[PDB]
Design a protein around this nucleic acid. Sequence first.
RNA 1: AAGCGCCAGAACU
RNA 2: GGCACCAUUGCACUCCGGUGCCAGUUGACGAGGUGGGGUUUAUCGAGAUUUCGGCGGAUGACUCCCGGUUGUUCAUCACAACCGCAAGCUUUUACUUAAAUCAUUAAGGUGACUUAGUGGACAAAGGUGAAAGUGUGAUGA
Length: 90
Amino acid sequence: RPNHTIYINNLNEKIKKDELKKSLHAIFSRFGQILDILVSRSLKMRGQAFVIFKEVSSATNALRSMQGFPFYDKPMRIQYAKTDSDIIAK
RNA sequence: AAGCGCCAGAACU
RNA sequence: GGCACCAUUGCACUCCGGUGCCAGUUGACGAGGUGGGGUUUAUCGAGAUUUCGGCGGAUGACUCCCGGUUGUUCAUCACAACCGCAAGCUUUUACUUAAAUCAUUAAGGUGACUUAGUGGACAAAGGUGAAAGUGUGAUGA
């Protein structure tokens, strides 16, 4: 079920790679320490974000609080990642 | 310090 | 890389849909070279995705004019080939810091790439001395 990494979608696709990465670190920093925020603007990966929390409890409070939150005019949709990311698994 | 200057076709970002 | 649009609500850990508009980046590595006017596709090699393509410059070549050398003095007009602070032709003889590519590893940038250092090697043309040979007449001191 719950995972170290959280999946964020329904984000504004117009916003560039580096800005959004720094902008999402502005909010998810309070819940706990972040290891790496993966951002891609490709066809299958745009308007999406993977945030790696070192604590699982950090990822849970993040989903509970930032769900539905309006970020760049768009309300956020957050779920747990299907599998563990490559920095925590290995 | 004159195989040197420039950039807009092309290519890459 | 950026802005608009069409399209995408999509679960990944070296990049990763299209069109148009805009911006950025690449875009010659050294040697050598200027009496003047015209003309023109301006010399030499090194390298090897573009050193391609475009445009500008240019000391080249050619030609004529101009001023000169050499043809054993030296004045003058031809004739012959040259030179534009150098200068007949051939056979030889040094000198003339090649740089980039390559490998490498530091700085800067979102990136394409950029700036600099280090390591080692390789030229061609030309010109600059030297050595032996071979090149005019006509008229006058």
